[PDB]
């Protein structure tokens, strides 16, 4: 939801074309009294309480909470035998069928999330195999997130990725309250 | 709009068995979008229900209403169609099983009144439906007689139970 923007919009009685004049005198006609033909009671009239977009849903959980969620997702995967640690993502071939057959033989479920340390240094073989698949998705370590982890039945992390995730997530437990955004220079950050 | 009445003359029954009673022929005919009121047309359709084809034609030939000529025209083509396409041997051996009027698609027009006021006038159309069944016209029901009343009254006395007990 945080990045949701709804583009739905309707017109109020003030924005519907026309509708200036009183359709008929207040009294004497025997009809119900009306001030404008574009009232929400009229066919073709404005919408009383419709959507008034574009509408933003932005909000931010505390940084520590978003970090803790990642920890829980990794623990759940390990506790339920859905986490597999690899030394590297290098395949013998770039054929997607090999990777598909490998998952079936190893009983890895229908979908597998493949996490590499960095986008630039992903092996070309795994890049070719995953590029041609739909349920086998390759992401860099900086792209890891709870939604993807829950959508995919199996999680595969490389050993460098494991060391990467421990450093980043455990930094949140031992850090001071910030004095200014962490993007700015600190004594001991980054690394 | 619905046009189911014209599809009832297209039902093919399977061949009858040797011992089964001969099935009477049934001919459905109608005229659509007649410029006439269904309310007024109902009276003419009511008149000929149960009549033989010849008796119905005689009654309609001497009626003063405009609908009578239209119904007579429909009845004659239905009678011709019964012998030509429905294997009816005798054209006189037909009777009005069903005859009714229906509402047609109508048009709206303005009727002017005084003081700048108006009304909405409907140009009325109607349908007429007829079913012809082969055979002599069914006999009318004899008026319930005193014997029948007494028998029914005593029957209700004899069906009378002791209520709200064992």
């Amino acid at each position: 939801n945080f990045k949701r923007i709804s583009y739905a919009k309707t017109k109020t009685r003030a924005e519907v074309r026309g509708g200036g004049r009183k359709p008929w005198p207040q009294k004497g006609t025997g009809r119900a009294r009306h001030g404008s033909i574009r009232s929400p009671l009229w066919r073709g009239g404005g919408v009383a309480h419709g959507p008034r977009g574009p509408t933003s849903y932005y909000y931010m959980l505390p940084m520590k909470v978003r970090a803790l969620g990642l920890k829980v997702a990794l623990t759940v995967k390990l506790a339920q035998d859905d986490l597999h640690i690899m030394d590297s993502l290098e395949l013998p071939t770039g054929d997607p069928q090999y990777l598909t057959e490998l998952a079936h033989y190893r009983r890895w479920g229908d979908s597998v999330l493949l996490v590499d340390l960095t986008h630039e240094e992903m092996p070309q073989s795994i890049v070719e195999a995953t590029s041609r698949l739909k349920t086998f998705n390759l992401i860099p370590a900086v792209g890891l997130n709870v939604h993807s982890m829950l959508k995919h039945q199996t999680l595969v992390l490389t050993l460098p990725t494991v060391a990467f995730l421990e450093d980043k997530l455990l930094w949140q437990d031992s850090r001071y309250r910030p004095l200014y955004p962490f993007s700015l220079p600190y004594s001991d950050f980054p690394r | 709009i619905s046009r189911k009445w014209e599809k009832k003359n297209k039902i093919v029954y399977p061949p009858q068995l040797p011992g089964e009673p001969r099935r009477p022929a049934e001919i459905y005919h109608c005229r659509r979008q007649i410029k006439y009121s269904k309310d007024k047309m109902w009276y003419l359709a009511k008149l000929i229900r149960g009549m033989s084809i010849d008796q119905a034609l005689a009654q309609l030939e001497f009626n003063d209403k405009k609908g009578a000529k239209i119904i007579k025209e429909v009845l004659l083509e239905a009678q011709d169609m019964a012998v030509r396409d429905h294997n009816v041997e005798f054209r006189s051996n037909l009777y009005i099983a069903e005859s009714t009027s229906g509402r047609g698609q109508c048009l709206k027009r303005i009727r002017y009144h005084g003081r700048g006021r108006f009304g909405i006038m409907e140009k009325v159309y109607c349908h007429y439906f007829v079913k012809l069944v082969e055979g002599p016209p069914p006999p009318p029901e004899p008026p319930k007689t005193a014997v029948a009343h007494a028998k029914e009254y005593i029957q209700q006395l004899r069906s009378r139970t002791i209520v709200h007990t064992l």
Partner: peptide
């Protein structure tokens, strides 16, 4: 008592002009 008159309102013509 001030004269009170309510003039008649004509409906749109097309509503009584449609043909088959």
């Amino acid at each position: 008592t001030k004269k009170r008159f309510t003039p008649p309102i004509y409906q749109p013509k097309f509503k009584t002009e449609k043909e088959f």
